[PDB]
Amino acid sequence: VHLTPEEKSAVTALWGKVNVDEVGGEALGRLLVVYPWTQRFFESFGDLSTPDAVMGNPKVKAHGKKVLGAFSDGLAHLDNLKGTFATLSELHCDKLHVDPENFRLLGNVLVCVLAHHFGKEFTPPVQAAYQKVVAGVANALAHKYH
């Protein structure tokens, strides 16, 4: 939305370092463990009874990478987020009936994993900038709800 170039670059830089395959998994996984009500949407996924049930779930694991990739693609069009997520936003509303708040839980969970993996490298301002990103992605995903 309001990403200064230096925010834009700090974002992109780090994102270079991310292993979307595995970061997706931890984000979704962790989502499902931290806010267990979110489990309701993937009753289909089988065993989610435990943190290891969840974290390790190959199904959890694969969806996480799908999610994160959608996301990564969104990073490449920080200028037209609404538009980028247009078809997925309708899908989320018309088909999965996922309350849009769910999107800000994932956003925050995500910031934790970056924090987790990047440690010290994940500085306040970088946090600051990522914050705008997930803020913007969640808004993006909620644009077509009605």
Partner 1 sequence: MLSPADKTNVKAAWGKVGAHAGEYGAEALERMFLSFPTTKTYFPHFDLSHGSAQVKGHGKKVADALTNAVAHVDDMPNALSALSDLHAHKLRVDPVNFKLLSHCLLVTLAAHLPAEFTPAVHASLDKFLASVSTVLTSKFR
- Pick out the residues of the known binding site for heme b: 63, 92
With CB under 8 A as the contact rule, which of the stretches 10-18, 73-81, 82-90, 116-124 interacts with partner 1?
116-124
Element (H, E) at 121: none
Do residues 142 and 100 make contact, with C-beta atoms less than 8 angstroms apart?
Answer: yes
Do residues 21 and 85 make contact, with C-beta atoms less than 8 angstroms apart?
Answer: no
**Any residues with CB less than 8 A from the CB of 143 and at least 6 apart, and which?**
82, 85, 86, 89
Of 6 and 87, nearer to ligand HEM (C-beta) is 87
Q: Does residue 70 belong to the site contacting partner 1 (CB under 8 A)?
A: no
- Single out the residue of 18, 70, 75, 111 in contact with ligand HEM (rule: CB under 6 A): 70
Q: Does residue 111 belong to the site contacting ligand HEM (CB under 6 A)?
A: no
**Any residues with CB less than 8 A from the CB of 142 and at least 6 apart, and which?**
89, 100, 103
CB atoms within 10 A of CB 102: 20
With CB under 8 A as the contact rule, which of the stretches 11-19, 28-36, 60-68, 76-84 interacts with partner 1?
28-36
Which residues of this protein are in contact with ligand HEM, per CB under 6 A? 38, 41-42, 44, 63, 66-67, 70-71, 88, 91-92, 96, 98, 102-103, 106, 137-138, 141
